[PDB]
Amino acid sequence: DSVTLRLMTEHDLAMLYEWLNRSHIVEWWGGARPTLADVQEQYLPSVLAQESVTPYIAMLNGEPIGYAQSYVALGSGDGWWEEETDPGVRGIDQLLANASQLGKGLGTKLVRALVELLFNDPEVTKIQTDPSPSNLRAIRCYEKAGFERQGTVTTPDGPAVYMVQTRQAFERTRSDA
Numbered sequence: 001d002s003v004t005l006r007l008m009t010e011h012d013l014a015m016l017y018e019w020l021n022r023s024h025i026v027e028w029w030g031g032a033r034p035t036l037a038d039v040q041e042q043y044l045p046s047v048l049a050q051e052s053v054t055p056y057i058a059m060l061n062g063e064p065i066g067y068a069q070s071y072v073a074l075g076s077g078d079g080w081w082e083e084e085t086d087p088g089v090r091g092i093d094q095l096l097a098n099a100s101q102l103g104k105g106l107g108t109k110l111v112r113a114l115v116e117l118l119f120n121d122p123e124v125t126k127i128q129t130d131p132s133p134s135n136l137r138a139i140r141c142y143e144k145a146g147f148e149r150q151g152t153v154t155t156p157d158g159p160a161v162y163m164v165q166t167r168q169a170f171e172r173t174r175s176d177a
């Protein structure tokens with residue numbers, strides 16, 4: 001059915017810890033097999049706020065099915081998005097909790113939901129994402145969700161395929177009119 005997003009709370013941290021240690025997630029996220037204390041210290045919504053990151057839980061049929069986050073690119077940690085000048089740019093990262101639910105279009109639905117959420121903030125001008133060049137499945141998911149590959153950028157987490165979706169693009173693709 002429909003994928004929706006809710007803010008993540010401190011009550012979700014134990015569940016997130018479990019997720020972040022699932023093998024299909026470890027492959028792409030972290031580098032990193034975080035301990036419970038790691039997840040508690042780093043993903044606490046108030047702590048994430050210090051790097052302009054907002055955490056979400058993705059929901060499907062009343063069940064938590066994934067984690068996502070958005071961030072203000074201009075507000076990111078040292079080394080991150082240092083050429084950015086537009087405070088309207090938001091980036092996203094996300095994961096699906098269940099190995100059995102990968103590759104079935106659920107991630108595309110999640111990304112679409114997150115993109116819509118973000119453009120409902122009228123200050124937001126463009127959404128970006130930075131999948132690993134190795135992560136072809138994530139790249140194709142973002143493409144299906146309306147992102148376009150720009151090129152390769154150097155990040156603190158290595159080279160990334162920089163992908164964007166502008167507000168004008170989102171407007172244009174809302175209808176075939």
Ligand SMILES: CC(=O)SCCNC(=O)CCNC(=O)[C@H](O)C(C)(C)COP(=O)(O)OP(=O)(O)OC[C@H]1O[C@@H](n2cnc3c(N)ncnc32)[C@H](O)[C@@H]1OP(=O)(O)O
Binds near residue numbers: 025107109141
């Ligand atoms: C910036 C970031 O957050 S980067 C990545 C983040 N997180 C992760 O990788 C965690 C582990 N993976 C996941 O959570 C999920 O796979 C997600 C969220 C990345 C993607 O969601 P999914 O539901 O798996 O993707 P979805 O099924 O919507 O689309 C994936 C597409 O990739 C395609 N694909 C998979 N592998 C490849 C490949 N090697 N080459 C080309 N295409 C591929 C699939 O065929 C599908 O495209 P299609 O509809 O044209 O057939």
Ligand SMILES: NC[C@@H]1O[C@H](O[C@H]2[C@@H](O)[C@H](O[C@@H]3[C@@H](O)[C@H](N)C[C@H](N)[C@H]3O[C@H]3O[C@H](CO)[C@@H](O)[C@H](O)[C@H]3N)O[C@@H]2CO)[C@H](N)[C@@H](O)[C@@H]1O
Binds near residue numbers: 043092
């Ligand atoms: N990883 C250790 C911790 O990272 C924290 O940083 C938090 C975020 O700022 C950081 O997220 C960065 C984001 O900042 C940056 N602007 C974009 C980058 N892709 C994100 O990276 C995140 O998502 C990708 C998936 O796309 C994962 O592969 C990666 O391991 C994960 N950290 O990941 C952490 C969870 O959101 C703090 N710097 C600190 O507590 C500590 O260094």
Ligand SMILES: [Ca+2]
Binds near residue numbers: 123
């Ligand atoms: Ca405002």
Ligand SMILES: [Ca+2]
Binds near residue numbers: 171173174176177
């Ligand atoms: Ca149109």
